[PDB]
Write a protein that binds this ligand. Structure first.
Ligand SMILES: O=C1NC=C[C@@H](O)N1
Ligand SMILES: O=C1NC=C[C@@H](O)N1
Ligand SMILES: [Ca+2]
Ligand SMILES: [Ca+2]
Ligand SMILES: [Zn+2]
Ligand SMILES: [Zn+2]
Lengths: 156, 161
C-alpha cells in the first residue's frame, strides 16, 4: 500500500461497524470485525464480540471474526486485511500476528489502545487507524453505561 | 527480548498442572485433534479454574488452540481472578495464545516443551513481565512429534503456515 488505503477498506470497516452495531443490539460489547481477501475483495468472515452472548472469555470481535472464517490454508491469511472497529488488545494482536495477516485496519483507538497496536508494527504489519466516529460513539456509549463489563472484556 | 531474561522458579502446583495439561493433550489426540492441552491454576491454592485442549479438528475452529480453549472453559471472570494464576500449556505458546496470556495478565506460564514448536511469544511473555518455565516434558514432546510426523499439513494449518 505505501500507506495508500486499499480499495476494499471502506467495505471492510462498514462491515465491521455493522457487526459492532449488531452486537450492541444483542446486549454485548460493540466491537465488530471482518476479514477480507485482498486479492479479490471477498469477505472471508465477519463477527463481533460474544462475551455476553456466549459467556465467552475469548470471543473478542477479532477472534470471533477469525472463528467465523473457519479453518483456512495458512497462505490465505497472508493476503488479507482484518478490519476491527476497536484497536486490538494484546490477544487479538497476537492472532493477527500468528496468522500473518499483513494489514489491520482499525476503526478507532481513542476508547482503547493496547501495546498491541505498536507491536503489530514492530512485527512488520501495517496498521491503519481510520478514526471512524461511528465506531467511537458506539463504543463510548458502552463504556459509559457498562464500565465494569468493559473492564472485564479487557481483563481489568 | 532481553539478555537478562531468566526462567522462573518452580511452583508446588506444576506437576499437577502439567499432568492435567498432558491429559487434555492426550484426550484431544484420541479425538483426532492436535495434541495440545492446557489448564489454568490459582497459584495460591492449586485450584483448577479450567482445562482444555486444541479444538481445531473437533470443532472446525481457527481460534481454539489449547490455551484459548482452556481460557474459554474457565468462563467469564473478573480481571482480578487471573492475576495470580499459572497457565499450563503442553506446547510453547504461539503469538496468539501469548497474546491471550498477556491480555488477561496471567502472570506465569509453564510450558511442557518448546522443541517441536516455539514462537516469539515465549520471549515476549518475559518482555511483557510474565514468568515462563519450560519443563521439557517427554510425554508432551512425544505426542506432538508424532502428530507433526503423521499429519504435517494439519499441524501447519494450526500455526498458520
Ligand atoms: O472485542 C474486543 N474487545 C477488546 C478489545 C478488542 O481486541 N476487541
Ligand atoms: O493449540 C496450539 N496450537 C499451536 C500452538 C499453541 O499455542 N497451541
Ligand atoms: Ca469489576
Ligand atoms: Ca517474579
Ligand atoms: Zn481483543
Ligand atoms: Zn496458540
Amino acid at each position: 500500500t505505501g500507506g495508500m488505503a486499499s480499495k476494499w477498506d471502506q467495505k471492510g470497516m462498514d462491515i465491521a461497524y455493522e457487526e459492532a452495531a449488531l452486537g450492541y443490539k444483542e446486549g454485548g460489547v460493540p466491537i465488530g470485525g471482518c476479514l477480507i481477501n485482498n486479492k479479490d475483495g471477498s469477505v472471508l468472515g465477519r463477527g463481533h464480540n460474544m462475551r455476553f452472548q456466549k459467556g465467552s472469555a475469548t470471543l473478542h470481535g477479532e477472534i470471533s471474526t477469525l472463528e467465523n472464517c473457519g479453518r483456512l490454508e495458512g497462505k490465505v491469511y497472508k493476503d488479507t486485511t482484518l478490519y476491527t472497529t476497536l484497536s486490538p488488545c494484546d490477544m487479538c494482536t497476537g492472532a493477527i500476528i500468528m496468522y500473518g495477516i499483513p494489514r489491520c485496519v482499525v476503526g478507532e483507538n481513542v476508547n482503547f489502545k493496547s501495546k498491541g497496536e505498536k507491536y503489530l508494527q514492530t512485527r512488520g504489519h501495517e496498521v491503519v487507524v481510520v478514526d471512524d466516529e461511528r465506531c467511537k460513539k458506539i463504543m463510548k456509549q458502552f463504556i459509559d453505561e457498562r464500565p465494569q463489563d468493559w473492564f472485564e472484556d479487557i481483563g481489568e
